[PDB]
Design a protein around this ligand. Structure first.
Ligand SMILES: CCCCCCCCO[C@@H]1O[C@H](CO)[C@@H](O)[C@H](O)[C@H]1O
Ligand SMILES: CCCCCCCCO[C@@H]1O[C@H](CO)[C@@H](O)[C@H](O)[C@H]1O
Lengths: 107, 107
């Protein structure tokens, strides 16, 4: 089952965190990351097209994120606003989609 | 600008309803319809890839829906459970996706 977890779980303000992703389905179009516990386009961080390996910012993009080809998400110079939940949506080639939510806590 | 509306807005139990879709963006991979007001994989009705013109059922699929190449969704022999909100997610080529929510009322 698709899952995501934060390394580290508790993050000091101004440092770094990596959202690891495990168990990606086969045959994907792309990835979309969202701030919060649900898919919500108004809160999209980034969209990643696998076919072209291209990332594109959403409205929630801070400029401090970096998504990787396996959907992992790096955030640098973490701020208070970065704290809390993140939701990854994986878009499969049949447009039937899966989500996983994770969190980390800034201090 | 992406919107959806029901025809008819008030629907007799056992009849038919067409969810019309307006202002699709350019450059999309496909469509994802969900029951309710938000994107939620657990409530996904159908996924549709415009390149292959293939429909695939999600967990919320009743077997009474038909999706069209312009994302329009036909529901036949409408039940009480069908009532309420539907949400369309349009998957864009850059994976920064768009949503539109509509509804109809069964009586
Ligand atoms: C400094 C952070 C940049 C490094 C690139 C992040 C890529 C990490 O990605 C990780 O590769 C691991 C090895 O299999 C897997 O366990 C993980 O599922 C995956 O999340
Ligand atoms: C009962 C069978 C009806 C099939 C409906 C086919 C889809 C119709 O769809 C509609 O076609 C119109 C012209 O493009 C547009 O006004 C609409 O945006 C569109 O939703």
């Amino acid at each position: 089952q698709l899952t995501t977890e934060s390394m580290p779980f508790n993050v000091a303000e101004g440092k770094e965190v990596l959202l690891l992703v495990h168990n990606l389905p086969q045959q994907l179009f792309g990835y979309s990351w969202y701030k919060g516990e649900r898919v919500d386009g108004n809160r999209q961080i980034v969209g990643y097209a696998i076919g072209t390996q291209q990332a594109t910012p959403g409205p929630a993009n801070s400029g401090r994120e970096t998504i990787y080809p396996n959907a992992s998400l790096l955030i640098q110079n973490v701020t208070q606003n970065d704290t809390g939940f993140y939701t990854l949506q994986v878009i499969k080639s049949d447009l039937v989609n899966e989500e996983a939510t994770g969190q980390f806590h800034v201090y």
